[PDB]
From a paper:
One intriguing example is the African swine fever virus, which stands as the sole mammalian-infecting virus encoding a type II topoisomerase. The ORF P1192R encodes a functional Topo II (pP1192R) which is highly conserved across diverse ASFV isolates. Prior extensive structural and biochemical studies have elucidated key aspects of Topo II catalytic mechanisms. These structures have unveiled the inherent architecture of Topo II, which is characterized by two principal heart-shaped functional domains: the ATPase domain, responsible for ATP hydrolysis to fuel the molecular machinery, and the central domain, which interacts with the DNA duplex and contains a catalytic tyrosine residue that cleaves the DNA duplex. As a result, Topo II not only relaxes DNA supercoiling but also disentangles knots and catenates potentially detrimental to cellular function if left unresolved.
The ATPase domain of pP1192R (1-434) was expressed in E. coli BL21(DE3). Owing to the modest resolution of the ATPase domain in the cryo-EM density map, truncated pP1192R ATPase domain (1-434) with either AMPPNP or ADP was crystallized. The crystal structures of the ATPase domain complexed with AMPPNP and ADP yielded high resolutions of 2.3 Å and 2.6 Å, respectively. Both structures contain a protomer within the crystallographic asymmetric unit and these high-resolution crystal structures were employed in the cryo-EM structure construction. The AMPPNP in the structure of ATPase domain partially acts as an inhibitor of pP1192R but lacks specificity.
Numbering used by the authors:
A (entry chain A), B (entry chain A): 3 to 405
């Protein structure tokens, strides 16, 4: 039988939008746990629901998108408050709110009065990034993420104020009940999404178990730390009302390596480009090099997205490898052995944070960015001091393994 | 400005559907090249357009989906003819055709007469897999792939016959011109998609250059070889009218390793499960182990999809590693050295082909399958002879590297 579906039912049934709709093994799943005034990034060796993490992610990247959008403007985003308590998830930013105004074409379609936040939250393929510029470094592009959050919410509340009015709209039952909004005068300016996911439909206990709750809190806490490193310097990231410590890639590196390699040496670099638009967006990099690292490992926040695959990583890997091979054959008086990238890089843990204009993704989840490798070969340069430091640490480890 | 988009314009502008819409560096890009009656899988070190390869892939996986759907039936798919010539791309299968019948709800929506092939090819989120069963091993799930092919076609022709009628419909200008279909009597039974992509819009020369043409032909030829290993035994896969040789994972392994390691030993296993539905779908595996392999490498055809990431790989990796560590500490009289998965597996090239029921993906592209790791720990077993052979080859290589 041949069936025609709408966005709503499709997004509830299909994994192409946010990942699997039940618990699966997520490789590299991490969370932040507090051990006596110390943040540690630890693995979560338990299956979780990718789509569940995506609905947090979509709203968080919407907030960091607003922050970049306003950072060179008069009214800026000074904070991103994220909270997670008793299952309820909330995110609030303070730049200009979403325009409290009637959407003409959306109302013509709906045959009733529809305002912009209702389009932004309930209309698939809708937003301000349908026509993205080549220089735009927002993560958002599809006009889909927010509605993915709504469709996986038992209940949700969009609140937004623009300095003259406040606008409150309830969106319930997986986008099936869209209450008419309530518009009052207010002089506040902010955007807040507040929602309860459908934890049971997504494979979780109702309410969340002790372990599920702790795992999800740790994961969200981690995402907030990542924002705090990516976001600009006038913006505080809060999670459950505490500010997020990690405003630098060095802080992120220390967090991820607190256990494998405490008290270790952090190689740092700011990778710059010479031609606009790339020269507008330096990449911050911190790397630790340890013999007790078993494989190569990276953490990337690119355009606010915690993506796990992309040619920026390969750019750093290949550059470091070429230098490592040169100095290994120099330092070794054996002069015959041939090492490759796995030997070069398996003792490296690296953090890369920043914006890259003009990238594309392999799906809505934005797990993998898509780019020509030559973008980096043409435009970017890794500072030689960082390369030298790194090569030195790595060749030390190689020579001692063959010692 | 807040914009509302339709499927058509969205799919032309957005990379979430099929990948990047221009040329990017695709890691692991391979193609099949003929060298004097020998097929070799060689890297393509040139940027290509992921969405362009996806429109070939979508139709090819639709065909292998039909093949699985009909394999236990009376009228089977006996062939999948694929061709690529002068830019035109074509794919034809011979099971029962697409129902030549009026679609009621689609006609009610369109306010005119719409037949099932027009829904199948022009209506997003539409198909026979909107409600997939947990045991279904077709790649198709979203009701999207075929329309992605149409939207990236300057012109296309859907032809399908059901044994009493033939149905010809033209779909042109990136799904903007949908000509009314032409229905005649015929006693043939088949489905054919024939189309010209928008190579210029996707970053290519018009017409294709010598290198682009050769790269794309090699890549499609490779995909067909993969089908020929995945498809059932009554089904011939043709590419440009020649049959595709590689009906076994051993043939695939030899093709991929013809240069790095000719005349090499191929470890083979059929990984079975004991509980339905998994016991209905054995995984075929072929692996080569060579000192001149620089990193771990796999080729996977799962449910007809050439996916590149999934916990099936990790299942094999971890099992082989546990055995390799045991026998390494046994064979070594050093008895202290500790090796991990990278040491265990960096000399392995492995092919895994077959069906897995109940999997999910991370996006439409289906680059990565999503599953609980325990599915394999509970249900599947790797034959011990294969594990033993593999461990032996690997420990030989490790002992000679430390020799
Ligand atoms: N916190 C926010 N502050 C301001 N505007 C917002 C905020 N969240 C969402 N928006 C607006 O709502 C629109 C719709 O959001 P969304 O559905 O996530 O699409 P998107 O972020 O543009 N692209 P994508 O996330 O890739 O689907 C966005 O384009 C923004 O214009
Ligand atoms: N070669 C074919 N033979 C028979 N039926 C086909 C063939 N190609 C397509 N169809 C039918 O057309 C429908 C629509 O195709 P498609 O748009 O690719 O969706 P899908 O394959 O079901 N799921 P997806 O590919 O993940 O978007 C399919 O569900 C099939 O029922
Ligand atoms: Mg968004
Ligand atoms: Mg399909």
């Amino acid at each position: 039988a041949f069936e025609i579906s709408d966005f709503k039912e499709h997004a509830k049934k299909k994994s192409m939008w946010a990942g699997a709709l039940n618990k699966v093994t997520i490789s590299g799943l991490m969370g932040v746990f507090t051990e006596d005034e110390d943040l540690m990034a630890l693995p979560i060796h338990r299956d979780h629901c990718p789509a569940l993490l995506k609905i947090f992610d979509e709203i968080i990247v919407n907030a960091t998108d607003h922050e970049r959008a306003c950072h060179n403007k008069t009214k800026k985003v000074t904070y991103i408050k994220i909270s997670f308590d008793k299952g309820v998830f909330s995110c609030e930013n303070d730049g200009p709110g979403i325009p409290i105004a009637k959407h003409e074409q959306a109302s013509l379609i709906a045959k009733r009065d529809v305002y912009v936040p209702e389009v932004a939250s309930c209309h698939f393929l809708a937003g301000t990034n349908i026509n993205k510029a080549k220089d735009c470094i927002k993560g958002g592009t599809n006009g889909v993420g927010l509605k993915l959050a709504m469709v996986h919410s038992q209940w949700a509340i969009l609140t937004t104020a623009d300095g003259a009015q406040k606008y409150v709209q309830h969106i319930n039952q997986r986008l099936d009940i869209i209450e008419p909004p309530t518009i009052t005068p207010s002089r506040e300016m902010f955007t807040r999404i507040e929602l309860m996911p459908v934890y049971q439909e997504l494979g979780y206990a109702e309410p969340l178990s002790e372990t599920e709750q702790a795992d999800l809190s740790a994961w969200i806490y981690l995402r907030a730390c990542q924002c705090a490193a990516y976001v600009g310097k006038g913006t505080t990231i809060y999670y459950n009302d505490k500010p997020c410590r990690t405003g630098s890639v060095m802080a992120l590196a220390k967090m991820y390596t607190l256990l494998s390699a405490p008290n270790s040496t952090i190689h740092t670099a700011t990778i710059k480009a010479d031609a606009k638009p790339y020269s507008l967006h330096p990449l911050q990099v911190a790397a630790v090099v340890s013999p007790k690292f078993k494989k190569f490992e990276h953490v990337s926040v690119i355009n606010g997205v915690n993506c796990v695959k992309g040619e920026h990583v390969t750019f750093l890997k290949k550059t470091i490898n070429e230098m490592v091979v040169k100095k290994f054959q120099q330092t070794i008086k054996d002069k015959n052995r041939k090492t490759t990238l796995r030997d070069s890089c398996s003792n490296i843990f690296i953090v890369i944070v920043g914006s890259i204009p003009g990238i594309e993704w392999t799906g809505q989840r934005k797990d993998e960015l898509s780019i020509a490798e030559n973008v980096f070969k043409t435009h970017y340069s890794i500072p030689s001091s960082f390369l030298t430091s790194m090569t030195k640490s790595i060749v030390d480890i190689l020579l001692q393994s063959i010692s």
